[PDB]
UniProtKB/TrEMBL annotation:
GO terms for cellular component: chromosome, telomeric region. The chain holds residues 369 to 897 of 907 of the full protein. One of its GO terms (biological process) is telomere maintenance. This is KLLA0F20922p. The lineage of its organism: Eukaryota, Fungi, Dikarya, Ascomycota, Saccharomycotina. One of its GO terms (molecular function) is DNA binding. It comes from Kluyveromyces lactis (strain ATCC 8585 / CBS 2359 / DSM 70799 / NBRC 1267 / NRRL Y-1140 / WM37) (Yeast).
Length: 519
DNA sequence: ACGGATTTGATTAGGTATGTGG
């Protein structure tokens, strides 16, 4: 029987059926579909979400990666479950937001990924691709020093352990925001609660949770003020979560905003003044199940969320589930039809970062000159070499020159914003076949961009007869290919191959002529 | 930028009902 091998992007011909293999400490570079390639809400179909994963043993050419050489292309077979496990929260309610969430996770985290060989059909051919079995977070952002330093002089505290004096004391409180009020004065009221009581705290104005029937006691409702010059920064941080400002939260005819379950890490200055506990919000950071937190912060955040959910009147939870989901990990459960609180939190704990820091420095414009969407011109290079499929796979670097290859067409696919063509060696019988080594025997070739697809179909409308699209299946064609590039993250690309002078028409008529010659 | 010596400093019921975009 077989012998050990090192897992590698090109090693799928060696993978055992139903064996699980492990990518340790992988960087997910990017994925497809994404905002650059599929603008609009292209519905993410199972098996058609693809991620690209680098491991740090693999070579680094540039910001253009090459699947099957220095990154894995990995099919996601159950998008719902992949999103749920990795920490994406908006699917299916919002494709756009889901992908944006996935971007934030992969840009900041490293993952242990379990993959396996999965059969897929190429017309009447079959081959193998990498599929994702599981994903476990391996490493996360380290605690920023600004957090470590600021909480050293603003220690974490429950409201009940705030001990005020004549002189200012500084603290960090994790709280539910309760009210926003402005009387046009010098400060803005953003009051908050812990459900934790303090004898110097006293604020009963609009002191309720969700509805008037669930009170917040006055010695739990911390009156707190923001200096006017600091409101706009807080406003813009919340706006990054709920796409609207602080004032706009108090929309129900009073100052209470608990129907939105907005949670902040408050950075506060406390001082007794004139008989009262005066609390000043010097900073506030929205805290979300996706916002990373230290373990110590979570000790306070977790019971906070538990009390909000348990004490919130049921009917308000029902009316505002989606709204509160911004901050509360609420889920819809099934046999019972009851919202439930999940335990879900992101925690704090170079090579690729510095490559895209270079690209952020220099032009995306240079690489964008090889975007697959850019109209494909004809005469870039003279005396193009004729080459095998294995040679093409090994080309690897953007030599920027045209290539010729003679290949059998296994299938052709209209994917809407691209045409995909699958090629194998010309010298095999029929198209019913199983390709055990896709790395050496299977080349996929694509056409992207309005101008290129218009030339391919002969129509600005992508109009075609379907039997003319697939007539070239089984024909052997002399292709000319150019390397082009597909954007998979803001500063990360993958390399692909695009055909030149290839039209539905030429492929169609060639196919008929070739049949007639053989017959 | 960066840090502290960090800007000021009020009421206590009860009505109505989202999500931030298909």
């Amino acid at each position: 029987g077989s012998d050990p091998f090192d897992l590698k992007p090109d090693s799928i011909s060696k993978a055992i059926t139903d064996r699980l293999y492990h990518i340790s400490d992988g960087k997910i570079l990017g994925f497809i579909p994404n905002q650059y390639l599929d603008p609009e809400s292209s519905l993410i179909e199972d098996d058609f979400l693809l991620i690209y994963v680098y491991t740090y043993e693999l070579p680094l050419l540039s910001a253009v990666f090459v699947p099957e050489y220095n990154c894995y292309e990995i099919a996601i077979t159950n998008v719902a479950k992949f999103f749920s496990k990795i920490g994406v929260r908006s699917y299916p309610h919002s494709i756009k937001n889901s992908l944006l969430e996935l971007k934030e996770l992969i840009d900041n985290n490293r993952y242990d990924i379990t993959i396996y060989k999965k059969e897929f059909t190429i017309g009447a051919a079959k081959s193998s691709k990498w599929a994702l079995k599981d994903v476990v977070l391996r490493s996360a952002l380290p605690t920023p020093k600004e957090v470590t330093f600021t909480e050293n002089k603003f220690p974490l505290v429950r409201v009940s352990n705030i001990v005020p004096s004549a002189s200012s004391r500084y603290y960090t409180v994790i709280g539910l925001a309760v009210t926003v009020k402005y009387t046009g004065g010098k400060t803005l009221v953003l009051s908050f609660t812990d459900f934790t009581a303090n004898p110097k705290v006293n604020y009963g104005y609009d002191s309720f949770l969700g509805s008037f029937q669930e009170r917040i006691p006055e010695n739990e409702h911390v009156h707190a003020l923001i200096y006017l010059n600091r409101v706009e920064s807080l406003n813009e941080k919340l706006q990054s979560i709920i796409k609207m400002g602080l004032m706009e939260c108090a929309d129900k005819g009073n100052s209470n905003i608990t129907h939105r379950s907005i949670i902040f890490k408050f950075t506060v200055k406390c001082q007794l003044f004139q008989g009262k506990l005066n609390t000043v919000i010097l900073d506030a950071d929205p805290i979300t199940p996706t916002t990373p937190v230290t373990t110590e912060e979570y000790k306070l955040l977790k019971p906070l969320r538990n009390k909000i959910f348990k004490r919130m009147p049921s009917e308000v939870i029902q009316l505002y589930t989606l709204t509160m989901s911004r901050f509360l990990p609420i889920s819809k459960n099934r046999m019972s039809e009851n919202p439930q609180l999940l335990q879900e939190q992101a925690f704090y704990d170079d090579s690729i970062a510095k490559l895209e820091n270079q690209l952020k420095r220099e032009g995306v414009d240079k690489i964008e000159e090889d975007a697959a969407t850019r109209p494909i011109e004809l005469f870039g290079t003279r005396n193009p070499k004729t080459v095998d499929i294995i040679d093409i796979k090994n080309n690897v670097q953007m030599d920027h020159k045209d290539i010729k290859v003679t290949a059998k067409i296994l299938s052709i696919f209209d994917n809407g914003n691209n045409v995909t063509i699958y090629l194998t060696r010309s010298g095999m019988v029929g198209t019913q076949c199983t390709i055990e080594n896709p790395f050496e025997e299977l080349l996929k070739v694509q056409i992207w961009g309005r101008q290129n697809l218009t030339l391919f179909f002969g129509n600005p409308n992508y109009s075609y007869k379907r039997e003319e699209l697939t007539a070239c299946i089984g024909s052997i064609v002399d292709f000319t290919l150019i390397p082009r590039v597909l954007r998979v993250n803001e500063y990360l690309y993958i390399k692909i191959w695009c055909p030149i002078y290839a039209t539905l028409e030429s492929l169609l008529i060639h196919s008929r002529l070739e049949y007639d010659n053989d017959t």
